Design a protein around this ligand. Structure first.
Ligand SMILES: Nc1ncnc2c1ncn2[C@@H]1O[C@H](CSCC[C@H](N)C(=O)O)[C@@H](O)[C@H]1O
Lengths: 5, 222
């Protein structure tokens, strides 16, 4: 998934 | 005693399985904390894919492989509208079972559901026009990613390509203990691609994502 950072 | 828990590789893979055992088999589950980014992700993938398929010297459109598919979000939204058939590979039987429901509208165009960890998977020889690898490369160790990319090259039909899409760190390689994944920097990722024997045909940074997110990149490889 996307991540922050 | 501690001989298994201190095997970092073994724990890296084991902890990732334990994470996905508790992820719902839904688009939100696939997207983690970022379901609102599925739409810009898809649009960017559509725009990138179309530059490398169709017509002279460019990849065909008969068959694609969706690696680390989960329930098949990329297959539904990106691949199936372009390819005559697709196959999925994922380590989670749970997700591949749900994929049969999620992809039902085109269920007859999903030729196989391959339940394997990628580090144990050999893409069928010269079967695919495109092999799509999204948000799973960070779940392989460097040695396993290198070897998997090399095997993927042998999964390609003439003029076929691999499309890799993932998070790319500013510097280093950064472990996320929560889902047991790493984020690689550009230099490290490009080095692994090179060492696998692949060459970069094109690349593009994902637009429309929050400034706080790790950058996301697409690469077309062969
Ligand atoms: N070592 C491994 N081998 C195969 N699949 C793996 C894996 N590690 C993680 N996965 C799978 O990688 C997926 C990450 S979630 C992203 C799913 C999909 N690529 C999408 O873009 O929507 C999950 O389905 C998970 O089960």
């Amino acid at each position: 998934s996307p991540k922050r950072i | 005693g501690t001989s298994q828990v201190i095997n970092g590789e073994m724990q890296f893979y084991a902890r990732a399985k334990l994470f996905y055992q508790e992820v719902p088999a839904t688009e939100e589950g696939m997207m983690g904390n970022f379901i609102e980014l599925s739409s810009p992700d898809i649009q960017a993938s559509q725009k990138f894919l179309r530059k490398f398929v169709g017509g002279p010297g460019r990849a065909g459109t008969d068959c694609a492989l969706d690696c680390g598919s989960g329930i098949g979000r990329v297959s539904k939204h990106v691949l199936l509208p372009v390819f005559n058939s697709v196959e999925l590979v994922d380590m989670m039987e749970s997700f591949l079972l749900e994929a049969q429901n999620y992809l039902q509208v085109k269920g007859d165009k999903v030729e196989s559901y391959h339940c394997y960890s990628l580090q144990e998977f050999t893409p069928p020889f010269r079967r695919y026009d495109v092999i799509w690898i999204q948000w799973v490369s960070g779940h392989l160790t460097d040695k396993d990613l290198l070897a998997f990319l090399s095997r993927c090259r042998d999964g390609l039909k003439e003029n076929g390509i691999i499309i890799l899409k993932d998070n790319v760190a500013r510097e280093g390689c950064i472990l996320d203990l929560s889902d047991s994944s790493v984020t690689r920097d550009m230099d490290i990722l490009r080095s692994l691609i090179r060492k696998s024997g692949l060459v970069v045909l094109g690349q593009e940074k994902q637009d429309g994502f929050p400034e706080q997110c790790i950058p996301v990149w697409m690469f077309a490889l062969h």
